[PDB]
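Recap quiz, item 2
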Amino acid sequence: YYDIDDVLADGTEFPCKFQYDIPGLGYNPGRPITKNTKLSLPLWLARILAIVGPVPFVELLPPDMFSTKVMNAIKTDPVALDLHSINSHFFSLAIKWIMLFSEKELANVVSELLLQRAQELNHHASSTSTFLLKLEEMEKEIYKKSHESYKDTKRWMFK
Amino acid sequence: PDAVFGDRVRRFQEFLDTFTSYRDSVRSIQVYNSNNAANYNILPHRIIISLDDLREFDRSFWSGILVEPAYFIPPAEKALTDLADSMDDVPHHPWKLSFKGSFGAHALSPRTLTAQHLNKLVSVEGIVTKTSLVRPKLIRSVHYAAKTGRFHYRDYTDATTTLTTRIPTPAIYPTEDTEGNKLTTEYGYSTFIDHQRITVQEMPEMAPAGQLPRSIDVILDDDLVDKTKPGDRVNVVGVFKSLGAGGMNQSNLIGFKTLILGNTVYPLHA
Amino acid sequence: MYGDLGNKLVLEAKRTKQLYARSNQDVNLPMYHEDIIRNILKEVSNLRKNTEYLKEQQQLGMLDDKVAKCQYFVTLLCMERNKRCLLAYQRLRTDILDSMAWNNNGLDLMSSITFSQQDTNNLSHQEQEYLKEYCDLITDLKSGDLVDIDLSGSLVPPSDVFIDVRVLKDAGEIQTEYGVFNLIKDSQFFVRQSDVERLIQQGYLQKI
Amino acid sequence: NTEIIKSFKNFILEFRLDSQFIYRDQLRNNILVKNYSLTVNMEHLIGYNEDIYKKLSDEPSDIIPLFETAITQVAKRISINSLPTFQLILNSNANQIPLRDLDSEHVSKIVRLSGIIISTSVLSSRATYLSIMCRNCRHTTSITINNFNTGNTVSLPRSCNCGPDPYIIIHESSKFIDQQFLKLQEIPELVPVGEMPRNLTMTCDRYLTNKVIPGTRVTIVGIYSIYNSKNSGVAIRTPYIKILGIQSDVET
Amino acid sequence: LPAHLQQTFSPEEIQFIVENEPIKIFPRITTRQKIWQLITTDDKALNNMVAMRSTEVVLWIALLLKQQSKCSIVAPQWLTTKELDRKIQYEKTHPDRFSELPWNWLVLARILFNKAKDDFHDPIHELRGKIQDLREIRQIKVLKGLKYLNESHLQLDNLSLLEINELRPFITEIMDKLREIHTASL
């Protein structure tokens, strides 16, 4: 991690439950943490506890970010759907979720959402918009990398 | 009718097996209409269809409904009733749709309307504001002559029909068949439905800076009468029809009132 | 409230990347935020206090327990998470101090300790000695090329050899190299682009 | 009617200041955003040709709906299905006519003025292109109206004999637009020492709706027209300004 | 540390590459001899010129001599109202291709029209009419050629050098996110 977009992605919370019993909690009541207790963990922490354990410590239940509501709302209209309201980050997280789960049915949905928002950051980069409010924070980098390249070509062609 | 209806009804016969759970619930309506007759000698005919298998059967029919619904709902209307006869043959009546919806990009609040959202499936929300009264309405009239035997018939539909428009019949009183007869209007055997117009405006919390609220008025028919109290937070789904003449018929400023022909009026609590 | 101080230092650093990005310079780097550093550095002293605490107790009471090996596997991690938020911040503050010593220091000045980077207070004691040695690393390079003495500036490609240069309100008749200029206010020139690029960067002659 | 399109179709393609030409770069960047309009500065018409502005200044009600179809034949030289009729928004600065002195001479003339907006209205629907069928013959047709002169200037015909007005509008295949119906009061620094401040009522087209909040200082370029509703005299009309192009200030 | 853009060419470094390709001039200073010399490193010939007899120099010298009016830039083969009409009517009847551009397509239409506007045949509404027309036909097929991008391969058969240096940071930042989904799912 030297990139600041990579560090901030780990701080999100995931509703994951336990399997064993631990006599200590750095977080408070009742230092023996009973099993079948559900907590929300940061993704820097619940990413190495899902492997090291044959039974690992953490069950890693699926969130609402990839529930059937969101997976149905992005097959209807990928353009006018909010992505700044879910949390804030989508593409830096849904790559991390695929590697720890190896699901071949999510990678055929994000690869179609990404094409449909790609075709409308090339239209609006031709020099009065609401598309500064409903973009993903991974797309606001390439929007400021594209709109400041068309501007420096249209500047040069006319004096 | 054409083949435009012809292939269109047939493709809605492939919607009975992929999601055959809808074909289960038609029998459950036919269950309560038998067991109520077993105690005497309640349920409507409205089927909640999720707008979720239509992405997984035909994308050229799912996007067909949300663009021009006056050409795909009345085909899917008559396709449902013939399946609502062939499975249930023991007893001797619209069978309307619902569209649960999985709400599309037409999720517009009633401040942003009327421009290009005519003839679509909007999903409007807000706070109900008038709550008018209920009156019946004629649809079918069966006449009867007792000098020559047989019954008769007369269809009669207004401009606020199911979805389309046809030649308007100002049928005041159908009488006087091609004989010497004084025909009789059989009440009881005729059909009557209920009619109720309510007006809904936008929510004051999601309002812009200080202005007047802009309301829109929605017609409910055949099932949703006395569903919501005034002053409730209501989500509604319908078709943004626009009827009336804009002063071009009276040979002489404003014109073309708009309405919504609602289906699902669905109370929310948030 | 266990690694929350990582999420307050990082979002503090994201502001400075977006003052450099669009159009403006990062003249006046904001401040060295130090009170959130001491709050992070207090907790890594406290998380060392437990891993030596369990080291004596695992040889007396626990006796090599696998459930007790989890605390060595959890308290190791929060040392990493606060290490990464403390290196992402002090690399981002480094490259802006790398660019500022690479654009407007050592350019027709040849010894510019003062007169540039006019804060000299928003940097720590350690970041103010890193910079001053780094400018002596540059002048090693410009002595073994002789392409041009101080190869630093002017990454604009050359065109239009003779330009018009209008004096903006700075008297002094200062220049001695390649002739005196006899500089008076508001009087424009016709000179070649080789002798003015050493003065067009000082905020001293306005027109190209 | 004829060939005045080609005298305007060459104006959009060939108008050019020093290096970068404007009306093929303002027409292209207003299609990618799906904005569907154009902004003509009115000084650039008379620098290019005077015979065009001579027709536009005399009889504006019959020529601006000819320029709206001269744009939509050019946007099919750039995009290559649904391209509607474009809208023309124009602005200029000659001399303000104050709100008190609007005689009977300025009927159907381009007039700019100023004032304070009192109130707005709710949006509505006007028809552009509608489809008609007869009740007995069932002979379908299509009437496309594009001109705007509020009640009735183009209506249904009387035969395709059959009865009095056998025609029905079909609501399933049409297109519609918006109207706004403002009101405008004169600025109180042109003081009516013995009078009350008067007011006028405007209309707005599809792309000027919901642009201005009540209580601002605007400058409005429009056609001073007339309409004859009975909603108090003999052969009396009523005045109103068909807005084409509202140049408000910075809203502040 | 360049740190401005650092991964593309800025469009003042594109007029630096196109100024290394030769064209023809009609000179107006002889300096041949009869029976002091330009001794530059990269060209080092054509000291010997005759008044009004064509020779071939590199392009960055022939803009030095136009500013003093001791030369006259000839037209290339494409700045012709008879030649650019075939390269337009190719574009309408083949909606998949790029017709042909001499790879200094846009750049040699800028440095010639601003500086050398006395040597063509009527640039008013004959050459700035076509070159803006041929940039708006061409910028449709680029916009329809991006609905079809994938994560392994692409073909862009004949594009200029300035229609690419505005299009790198859009494609290579999106196609690097379609690679990291297909190979992260495997």
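The radius of gyration of chain E is 21 Å.
The longest helix of chain E spans residues 128-144.
End of item.
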